[PDB]
A = this chain, B = another copy of it.
């Protein structure tokens, strides 16, 4: 129904009720209908059901309303529903005083009394309570109204108003990702502060600032005394605004009228808003604020609003927010790609958040739309209703030009810029979309005041500077490229245009409406194969110049007429090529003006074939140009800053003139596989980043660097390097690594001058004899890796000076013999001396070591000072026989490794307590495993021959019993290994699941039924592996478990839902066992599914399990 009417038919069904029915009918209101034949003495259940679902009721009261038990019961039910449910009750006092209804008096009271005779007490009580309550509520007194028809019309209008507000924002909940915005905005709000905090919202046009504001106002405004939302302030403002004060006054007037719902009153002066709102909770939303005038109009001071209030202004340039001093700003971010697809499919496939039918062109169109919700919506609306071929035929036109819907909105923001800002926008859109800001300033610095332009554009959110490079959204870039055809660029007054088009420039070049001067920038993308070179012969005779060339050549085919066309230009500024596909550079190419030159893939050999002059050049990038033998004379290149010969691989040598590159800062010869030497650099070079990663043939190096500012110096492989250049001050060595730089001899003493080098590696630095004595000079040195650094027979005693290094990994240093002794390192976490085959004397630096690893050493002694060291989390020693005379060592041990051959079975291990692990490498001649101590968590036998008996029932904890290759195991020992209760794996040599596991099978499925009523059940699982080429060294396995029913589909839980080990051997003929707990009690319904993560490594073969 719509409305439930309650009335007394004998009084009003004829005269007034008909008029109200007619008014409701004409206003589109359908009240519940009833008949006098449809009434009993009682009301009935269906009548109450109709009342309950009416969601609004109108009680029309007359003189004899109380004279019907039917009507009184209806009123009682109405009040009951009002109090319990959210039913809204309207009253009409048809010529009866509300006080008479309240006290049950007058003729109404007489009728009520006459009706009340005979009824039980509770009926009378409910009737009286309902009558009092209905008399209290605010309705319509017929006596007050001078005009009955006007009163009825007012009642109908109020009913209609209080009927189109039930469902709050039921529609348009199909907007995606608003929860992220709400959460990110709640932190800014902090409504708990009871302050008057201002909040801004800004971002590129078309992200959802308006929609986010609307959603927030819809969600929060109910918590505020007085809330209003102003929409599109920028649009509704006088563009010339001859009287700023009048427009300011009318803006504040609109704000107040919509604020108090105060019927568009007129306002005297500009301070009224403070007078009214300085004492009330206010939630205000100001949308699309363009300039500080509107802010001064609407919210100029914090003190304008009552204690506790929030005002939120959505803008587009940060400068307006900053001028008003807000500092509580949410930079709205783009939605996630999945949310982008959801929005696009919502707008393109009609409420389908996923696609329909095809799901292929949808993602192409989406990627075309960038990420703007505006772009996604426009494209989705454009494409909806079509079919796949229609999509395909519309796609190219959509790709080559953007819709006017996006274009107009972008154009409006573009027109609010200064002329130089527009020029910089065009420059970025056409040529420098993703380039470092410094290079942009260097190339455009004499035209546009690049720094200020970039600052303004970033403030306007027409560009973003992520890291050190600028980025413009692709949707905005397309607008820029389009406008580049219908607009010009001026510097003083010279007119310029930028040529940007995939092979659609060639027609413009074949013209006679020509100037040889209009075009300064070319951005060409040539991915596809050429049909014919569309340039005409006559245009090749032109002498037109370009100050910016950027060509993305992408094929093996060579362009000749294009080359001849470009190089006629007398003064190029920056040159970019990819896949140059030519042997040299043409001799007719002038380079006196050349600031940046990059040819990131080339076939250039000995370019320039002779010396030239390079006055203002600042960036050379010949990366990946593999077919490059040598490099031109770099004399008179003094202003060069960075040189990136990244992975040239055939650069036999470097020019001798490198000495004169005084301004050089970055030198990257990463692979550069053909190098032999590296000539001296000079005196004032001050190289900042020196990278030579894999120069396998590099032999010689400069004797000195002058490395006053050398952040990073990397020589990773550099296998044949005899000496090393000295260093001056090294005050900023952020990074120095020599990983595997074998064939070294020494280390320059100046290395200790690096006061801030926190981390340091020499792993693999074989043939290094001794460390320099100045190492102790280093400070903040935290990590010191040495691995298999054989022939390092020393360790300097100045190490005690370090006092900060946490770990000192020194592994495989087979010839290290001694360590410095009278040293205490105040904070030394670990000391990893493994396989130091000649260490021969216990490493005693009396410290706070927590992880000591001494395995494969030859110490055979343990000092008595160790009780000074209270905590050790890991002390690991390789077992030698004469440990038994060192009782101080036993209680402070953690691990142990029996040797290749130990016949004896050491009972002493029972006394020694902390045995977190015990390892048995080889030991083919071992009679049996020793009785395990109470603290045992790990047992390993990587290879073994005879282990007939394991005489120990050990039940410490989650213990791992790994037996990779030991077959002479007695049946009882084997059973003990399977039937021991643990929480980790246990792995045996076996060729078949043991019969102990009844329920067998071979993404595999295991089916069994359980014999129990209701309990938590425990299971033991046994798994073999699919016979594959398992690596003998394979050491990693993880297993996932899924348990499910078939009578039902209840995916049950499983407490150890996974078992993982990073050290278990993976081999074919072996048995892996573990344990499970299940608790859900779907009785006769158990189906198991064990999967091996990393199916590329291990796959589960046979399987069989057992219950307990």
**Mask of A40-57 contacts with B, CB within 8 angstroms, 1/0:** 111110100000000000
Residues of B within 8 A of A46 (CB): 138
In the complex, identify which listed stretch (A511-519, A602-610, A882-890) lies at the interface while the others stay far away: A511-519
From B485, B492, B517, A492 is in contact (CB under 8 Å) with B485
> Which stretch from A122-130, A268-276, A460-468 is at the chain B interface?
A268-276
Looking at the assembled complex, report how far the CB atom of A460 sits from the nearest CB atom of chain B, in whole angstroms. Answer: 14
Which B residues are CB-close (under 8 A) to A40?
88-91, 137-139, 162
Closest 9 CB pairs of A and B: A493-B508, A40-B88, A43-B138, A40-B90, A513-B517, A492-B508, A44-B136, A42-B136, A485-B493
A262 partner residues in chain B, CB cutoff 8 A: 30
Which of A494-502, A762-770, A1065-1073, A1095-1103 lines the interface with chain B? A494-502
- Which residue from B138, B497, B518 sits with its C-beta under 8 Å from A41? B138
**B486 & A140 in contact (Cβ 8 Å cutoff):** no
Name A504's closest neighbour in chain B (CB-CB).
Answer: B492
A495–chain B nearest beta-carbon distance, Å? 8
Interface check A531, CB cutoff 8 A: no
Q: In whole Å, how far is A507's beta carbon from the nearest beta carbon of chain B? A: 5
CB distance from A268 to the nearest CB of B (A): 7
Which residue of the partner chain B has the closest CB to A25? B265
Chain B contacts for A511, CB-based, 8 A: 494
For residue A37, which residue of chain B has the nearest CB?
B138
Q: Is the interface of A mostly helix, strand, loop or mixed?
A: loop
Question: Judging by beta carbons under 8 Å apart, are A507 and B485 in contact?
Answer: no
Contact pattern, A 241-275, Cβ under 8 Å of B = 1, otherwise 0 = 00000000000000000001010000010001001
When the two chains form their complex, are residues A513 and B515 in contact, meaning their CB atoms are under 8 A apart? yes
Q: Nearest Cβ distance between residue A535 and chain B, in whole angstroms?
A: 14
Tell me the nearest residue of chain B to A497, going by C-beta.
Answer: B493
Chain B residues near A486 (CB-CB < 8 A): 490
List residues of chain B with CB within 8 A of the CB of A491: 507
How near does chain B come to A279, taking the closest CB pair, in angstroms? Answer: 9
Interface residue ranges, A against B (CB under 8 Å): 28, 30, 37-44, 46, 88-91, 133, 136-140, 158, 162, 260, 262, 268, 272, 275-276, 485-486, 490-494, 497, 499, 501, 504-505, 507-508, 511-513, 515, 517-518, 545
CB neighbours of A30 from chain B (8 A):
260, 262, 276
Q: Which residues of B contact A272 (CB under 8 A)?
A: 28
* B residues in contact with A89, CB < 8 Å: 40
Instruction: Give the residue name and chain of the B residue nearest to A1 (CB).
Output: B280
A505 to chain B: closest CB distance in Å? 8
Beta-carbon contact of A492 and B513 below 8 Å: no
Inter-subunit contact B508/A512 (CB<8 Å): no
Smallest CB separation, A541 vs chain B (Å): 15
| Nearest Cβ on chain B to A261's Cβ, whole angstroms | 11
Residues of B near A158 (CB, < 8 A) are 39
The interface residues of chain B lying within 8 Å CB-to-CB of A90 are 39-40
A485 to chain B, nearest CB (A): 5
Residue of A38, A90, A260, A492 ringed by the most chain B CB atoms within 10 A: A492
From residue A9, how far is it (CB to closest CB) to chain B in Å?
A: 11
Do residues B493 and A42 form an inter-chain contact, with CB atoms below 8 A? Answer: no
Contact A28 B275 (CB under 8 A): yes
Given known contacts A30-B276, A276-B30, A515-B513, A42 and B492 CB-to-CB distance under 8 angstroms: no
- Among B28, B91, B494, which residue has its beta carbon within 8 angstroms of that of A508? B494
Q: Given A43-B137, A513-B517, 20 other A-B contacts at CB below 8 A? A: A28-B268, A28-B272, A30-B262, A39-B90, A39-B139, A39-B140, A40-B88, A40-B89, A40-B137, A40-B139, A41-B137, A42-B133, A42-B136, A42-B137, A486-B490, A492-B501, A492-B508, A493-B499, A512-B545, A513-B515
Known A485-B490, A486-B490: A39·B507 in contact at CB below 8 Å: no
| Residues of chain B within 8 A of A44, CB atoms compared | 136
List 22 A-B residue pairs with CB atoms under 8 Å apart, sorted by A's residue number: A28-B275, A30-B260, A30-B262, A30-B276, A37-B138, A39-B90, A39-B138, A39-B139, A39-B158, A39-B162, A40-B88, A40-B139, A41-B137, A42-B136, A485-B493, A492-B504, A492-B505, A492-B508, A493-B499, A494-B513, A512-B545, A513-B518
Known: A485-B490, A493-B508, A508-B494. A136 touches B501 (CB 8 A): no
- Minimal Cβ-Cβ distance residue in B for A133: B42
Tell me which residues across on chain B come within 8 A of A136, comparing CB atoms: 42-44
**Which residues does chain B contribute within 8 Å of A43, judged by CB atoms?**
136-138
Chain B: CB-nearest residue to A499: B493
Chain B residues near A518 (CB, 8 Å)? Answer: 513
Q: Across the two chains, which residue of chain B brings its CB closest to A41?
A: B138
Chain B's nearest CB lies how many Å from the CB of A393? 16
